[PDB]
């Protein structure tokens, strides 16, 4: 329905710019970071479901799917985790992300590298190592389905999403940069998952292209 546009916190915009502009070849770390976030979301619904089993009425299966689409030049990471509320998307996550962004930037000035971003809690933004645009479809039990989108440049949008219901969880859609299409290829995604995400406690299914 109505699209609302918001500015990132200045610190978050600055982090995104650093991610986009810094020469840094080891871009594959984005996948570990997004998988980690998906795992954390799954952990949360699992834990909440032990005191309120009805929280799984929106979907019992706790899983991560990684879906390449070469025709659309997208890599999608779908989880059936807890999902994000409207307040999470617009304000609350970025509020928390300020402190870790500051710590990370400081660590970079003192000699850390970009692969340490997850040690600071702000690994989502590493998506911009490979994506020109990120679309996030999300649904929490206590809210409606939303679509968040950002092509960086200091702004993001949020709108009620009337597309296909996802039930519960989050779908991170990476619109890949032209030179980052290796991350649509079978061997490559498998190699990266095996290297950095081997012990995640939820089934990770790596889909193949149909063509
Ligand atoms: N696949 C996912 N499923 C989920 S479902 C959910 C709610 N569930 C909560 C999530 C955070 N959990 C951890 C934590 O509270 C830890 N913490 C507390 N104090 C300091 N750190 C936290 C909060 C803010 C934050 F930036 C990182 C964090 F790790 C608590 C449960 C968040 C979430 N995320 C996620 C994780 C991360 C993020 C963002 C999103 N951000 C984002 C925002 C808008 C649009 C796109 C992405 C930006 C910052 O990063 C997923 O990708
Ligand atoms: Cl923000
Ligand atoms: Cl819930």
Method used for this model?
X-ray
Closest CA to 132 of 9, 12, 10, 30: 30
Q: Does a structural domain hold residue 173?
A: yes
How much is the CA Rg of the chain, to the nearest whole Å? Answer: 17
Domain count, the chain: 1
Q: CA-CA distances (angstroms) from residue 108 to 27, 30, 102, 114, 204?
A: 16, 17, 10, 7, 31
Side-chain half-sphere exposure of 36, counting CA atoms within 13 A: 17
Q: What is the resolution of this structure in A?
A: 1.5
Q: Does a structural domain hold residue 171?
A: yes
Closest CA to 122 of 19, 44, 24: 19
Ligand nearest to the CA of 81: 1
Q: Which residues line ligand 1 (CB under 6 A)?
A: 37-38, 40-41, 44, 79, 81-84, 88-89, 93, 96-97, 121-122, 124, 136, 148, 170
Q: Write out the DSSP string of the chain.
A: ---EEEEPPHHHHHHHHHHHHS--S-TTHHHHHHHHHHHHHHHHHHHHHHH-GGGGTT-----EEEEEETTTTEEEEEE-S----HHIIIIIHHHHHHHHHHHHHHHHHTT--GGGGGGGT-GGGGGGGTEEEEEEEEE-TTS--EEEEE-STTEEEEEE--SS--SSEEEEEEEE-GGGGGGGSHHHHHHHHHHH-TT-SS-EEE-----
Q: Does a structural domain hold residue 211?
A: no
| Residues near 148 by beta carbon (within 8 Å), at least 6 away in sequence | 89, 135, 136, 138, 156, 157, 158
Among 37, 62, 95, say which to mutate for ligand 1: greatest number of ligand atoms within 8 Å of CB. 37
Q: Does a structural domain hold residue 31?
A: yes
Closest CA to 164 of 139, 140, 133, 143: 139
Determine the structural domain holding residue 121 and report its residue range. Answer: 4-206
| Residues near 203 by beta carbon (within 8 Å), at least 6 away in sequence | 63, 64
**C-alpha 90 – ligand 2 centre gap (Å):** 7
CA distance 123 to 18: 13
Provide the token pair at 168: 């519960």
Give the atom of ligand 1 at the shortest distance from the alpha carbon of 38: 1
Other beta carbons within 10 Å of 66: 23
CA distance 194 to 188: 10
**C-alpha 57 – ligand 3 centre gap (Å):** 10
Among 5, 124, 133, 171, say which to mutate for ligand 1: greatest number of ligand atoms within 8 Å of CB. 124
Largest interatomic CA distance in the chain: 48
**C-alpha 145 – ligand 3 centre gap (Å):** 13
CA distance 198 to 93: 27
Query: What CATH number has the domain bearing residue 78?
Result: 3.30.565.10
Side-chain half-sphere exposure of 185, counting CA atoms within 13 A: 8
Q: Does a structural domain hold residue 169?
A: yes
Question: Which residue's CA is the closest to the ligand 1 atom numbered 19?
Answer: 96
């Amino acid at each position: 329905e109505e699209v609302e546009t918001f500015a990132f916190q200045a610190e978050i915009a600055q982090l995104m710019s650093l991610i986009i502009n810094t020469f840094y070849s080891n871009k594959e770390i984005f996948l570990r970071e997004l998988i980690s976030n998906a795992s954390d979301a799954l952990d949360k619904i699992r834990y909440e479901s032990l005191t309120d089993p009805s929280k799984l009425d929106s979907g019992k299966e706790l899983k991560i799917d990684i879906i390449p689409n070469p025709q659309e030049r997208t890599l999608t990471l779908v989880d059936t985790g807890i999902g994000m509320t409207k307040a999470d998307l617009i304000n609350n996550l970025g509020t928390i992300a300020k402190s870790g962004t500051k710590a990370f930037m400081e660590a970079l000035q003192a000699g850390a590298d970009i692969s340490m971003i997850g040690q600071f809690g702000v690994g989502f933004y590493s998506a911009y190592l490979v994506a020109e645009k990120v679309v996030v479809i999300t649904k929490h039990n206590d809210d409606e389905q939303y679509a968040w989108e950002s092509s960086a440049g200091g702004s993001f949008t949020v709108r009620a999403d009337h597309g296909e219901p996802i039930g519960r969880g989050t779908k991170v859609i990476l619109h890949l940069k032209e030179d980052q299409t290796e991350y649509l290829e079978e061997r490559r995604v498998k190699e990266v998952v095996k290297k950095h995400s081997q012990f995640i406690g939820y089934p990770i299914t790596l889909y193949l292209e149909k063509e």
